[PDB]
């Protein structure tokens, strides 16, 4: 029943809603969520196409812009700003609640810019002062150039979402790029106790690449156990003395948020990934799976169970020759050609 939002919350994790449109906002039924154990809003460009396509209250919108002389993408960001404007503020009250730690809703930068740091920059810094709420998140991709960027916003005082991520190896780097940030603030004197970052880390994903070529012991694991591997790293690095003397000072820990977790395979339960991930943590859900989760999910602090067991089968993946950071690096490579494609079916209708 509802009531097991709650019972999450207690166990210290934030459940988001991965969904975004005008008329969620519209309607009413967003402020209704936040009053009722929603805590968080993201989007994607695949999230904005079928949107776009889909509901209604966008007709209006588009045939008001296509009066001005305007390019497809400010058309479209047009659209977006206005709705996550308008999903900040009715997630405001909540945010403002915890002292600025819920109640956030994250916008995706283009993924043409995923390899120009400078660019991405730029445009996150740009949307950031577009949106004009501090409870928006600037979501960027978990690139190489997307860390650099991640340093520098943080530095800036911007709130991110760094998505995209697959691996451990590269969640790491991404700490330390916030780490970096962090303390550069610290040295000019800077607030930091504001600036909130998570960790967006794929799920569904990695079981959806191996699983069919995966001994039967391990389908349906492997997430999960990467997951469990992962939320241990960072533990270790978020309780250093290093991080330690940051958090002193007023620093935020990142957080790892569990993403890709509606199930794609219908040998698994549909409420798989949200049942067995739950530990300082969020798991933004599509809303059938927030539906299923309600409906027969369980709560219980299931994230840190069994780490033996994850490692376990992390060590039998390799043994297999499965390279999970070589998959990582293609499914991140996948997932932003995959948004880039939403995001030009989207952009046609707004030419």
């Known amino acids: 029943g509802m009531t097991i939002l709650s019972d999450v ?5 934030q459940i988001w809603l991965d969904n975004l ?20 809003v993201t989007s994607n460009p695949a999230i904005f196409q079928k949107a776009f396509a889909g509901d209604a209250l966008y007709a209006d919108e588009v045939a008001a812009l296509k009066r001005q002389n305007l390019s497809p993408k400010q058309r479209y960001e047009t659209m977006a700003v206005a709705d996550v404007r308008a999903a900040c503020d009715v997630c405001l009250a909540e945010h403002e609640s915890t002292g600025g730690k819920t109640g956030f809703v994250s916008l995706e930068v283009s993924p043409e810019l995923a ?5 991405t920059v730029e445009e996150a810094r740009r949307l950031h002062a577009a949106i004009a709420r501090k409870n928006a998140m600037i979501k960027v991709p978990a690139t190489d150039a997307g860390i650099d960027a991640l340093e520098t916003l943080v530095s800036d005082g911007i709130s991110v979402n760094l998505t995209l991520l697959f691996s451990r190896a590269q969640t790491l780097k991404a700490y330390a790029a ?16 504001h600036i909130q970052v998570v960790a967006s880390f794929f799920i569904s994903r990695v079981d959806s690449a191996l699983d069919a070529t995966l001994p039967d012991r391990l389908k349906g694991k492997t997430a999960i156990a990467l997951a469990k591997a992962a939320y241990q790293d960072w533990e270790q690095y978020f309780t250093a003395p290093e991080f330690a003397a940051l958090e002193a000072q007023g620093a935020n820990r990142v957080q790892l948020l569990w993403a890709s977790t509606g199930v794609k395979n219908p040998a698994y339960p549909d409420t798989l990934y ?18 299923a989760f309600i409906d ?4 219980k602090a299931t994230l840190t169970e069994s780490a033996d067991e994850a490692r376990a089968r992390l060590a039998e993946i390799a043994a297999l020759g499965i390279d999970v950071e070589t998959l990582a690096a293609r499914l991140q490579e996948d997932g932003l ?3 880039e494609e939403a995001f030009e079916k989207l952009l046609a209708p707004l030419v």
């Not at 005008?22 to 929603?38: D, I, T």
């Not at 916030?178 to 106790?193: D, E, H």
């Open 9 to 13: 919350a207690a166990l210290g994790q």
């Open 21 to 40: 449109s005008r008329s969620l906002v519209q309607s009413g039924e967003l402020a209704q969520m936040l009053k009722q154990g929603v805590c968080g």
């Open 115 to 119: 390899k120009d740091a400078q660019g």
């Open 178 to 193: 916030y780490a970096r940030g962090i303390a550069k603030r610290l040295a000019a004197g800077q607030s930091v106790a």
């Open 274 to 291: 949200v049942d067995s991930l739950i530990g300082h943590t969020v798991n933004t859900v599509p809303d059938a799976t927030l539906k």
């Open 296 to 299: 027969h999910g369980t709560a």
């Open 337 to 339: 050609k995959q948004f």
